Ligand binder design. Structure first.
Ligand SMILES: N[C@@H](Cc1ccc(O)cc1)C(=O)O
Ligand SMILES: N[C@@H](Cc1ccc(O)cc1)C(=O)O
Ligand SMILES: [Fe+2]
Ligand SMILES: [Fe+2]
Ligand code: NI
Ligand code: NI
Ligand code: NI
Ligand code: NI
Ligand code: NI
Lengths: 234, 234
């Protein structure tokens, strides 16, 4: 009954999460896809911190644990997508020449605090978790990720097709490989103690709270940048 | 008490080993041009701004009435203002170069600056579940390693500052002077057995993490031996 409640909590949080104004904007085919991807450079901090979360926090190569070996396999691949981010950054005309300090001031912007610190908050949440509870973190976080990338892949695929270029990050191929030997949701062959159950609730609430804080920063960046667009070239 | 006395002595011990690292003998070597010794200056980017965030977000807690946490909050306020000095001296040193956004991100998230980039993250993980007296120990150790670093860098720093007649703020005596009721002064504090052992864990991890960063700085110099500073005379 416990595990079943948690998987349901994720579904409910996903349903709130997918309705955020940011995603309504990103999905809106009456606005140019070049305007809908004006939030693209905001992902910078998040994408490479996500790589680092997978490489150095999620992964433990020496674990003999059944659950940790499956995590290790999944984090191996999920940590390769940051190159896709830098690919599409270039394609979208956002790999602009600037001073080193302009890039640093951007990454450490007070207006991208939640974006920058999302993976930090996950690593802190995860520090004392047993592998089975790290799976809940990853499933929650990946449920949020599928919503974000299913939305972003809409304008991305529109630009990819129109410019005749292969987008890799804001692209259906990203959503497909991310979704995914065993998948972590399938390890719903697991039942949780009462302790684990209240912890998994805490995890899902925070993961979606922090994910909503990031998306709120994107919505506000968009708002402060409607007077520009991605500049893809044909 | 005599448990605290052991901690303050372990910090002196750890400072004495740390002071001897090859990177510091290099930075102190007046036979090498100060432009060459500050080859490592841009490495600090991946740290100075994380140090600011550590002080704003991780150490500081504005919903606390504890005596100690209130001392912490005061100290963290000033320590969080030095990142702008870092950007000042970046430009003065000629390291505020024009580049692709992606080259700035690949710099910060370089595998060759992993320990530099993660030092403050590691400190936040260590600190997040400590009582304030124990956070005071993290901060005092960190600040002890910090003094060794800025005592060394201020040598080539002040050489360039006088030679070019420009006000250097970060690799500068003024930074070394302002970093120095003070936290050590609450060595009017007695630790339990448990706190004694955790203070030992804290002081060991701070100095190990600080050694790893300095080791990366030394490897950077060796791999970038031509990329000397290029300050301009006033
Ligand atoms: N898929 C993202 C990572 C991610 C995962 C979960 C999220 O909620 C958000 C983003 C990437 O490759 O960068
Ligand atoms: N004084 C440094 C921070 C620092 C502190 C402790 C250290 O060990 C190193 C660096 C700054 O303003 O950025
Ligand atoms: Fe991904
Ligand atoms: Fe400082
Ligand atoms: Ni997977
Ligand atoms: Ni702007
Ligand atoms: Ni102080
Ligand atoms: Ni904890
Ligand atoms: Ni290099």
């Amino acid at each position: 009954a416990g595990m079943k409640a948690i998987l349901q909590l994720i579904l409910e949080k996903r349903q709130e999460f997918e309705k955020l104004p940011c995603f309504e904007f990103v999905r809106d085919e009456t606005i140019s896809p070049e305007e809908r991807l004006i939030l693209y450079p905001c992902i910078a901090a998040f994408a490479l911190n996500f790589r680092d979360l997978n490489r150095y926090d999620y992964r433990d190569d020496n674990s003999s644990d059944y659950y940790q070996k499956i995590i290790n396999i999944h984090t191996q691949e999920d940590a390769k997508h940051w190159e896709w981010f830098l690919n599409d950054l270039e394609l979208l005309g956002f790999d602009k020449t600037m001073r080193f300090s302009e890039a640093l001031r951007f990454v450490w912007s007070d207006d991208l605090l939640h974006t920058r610190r999302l993976c930090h908050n996950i690593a802190v949440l995860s520090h004392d978790l047993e592998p089975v509870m790290k799976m809940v973190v990853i499933e929650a976080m990946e449920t949020a990720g599928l919503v974000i990338f299913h939305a972003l892949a809409k304008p991305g695929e529109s630009i990819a097709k129109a410019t005749r270029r292969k987008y890799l990050y804001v692209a259906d191929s990203h959503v497909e490989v991310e979704t995914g030997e065993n998948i972590i949701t399938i390890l719903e062959q697991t039942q949780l103690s009462s302790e684990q159950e209240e912890k998994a609730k805490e995890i899902v609430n925070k993961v979606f709270q922090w994910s909503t804080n990031l998306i709120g920063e994107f919505e506000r960046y968009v708002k402060a940048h409607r007077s520009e667009k991605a500049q893809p070239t044909a």
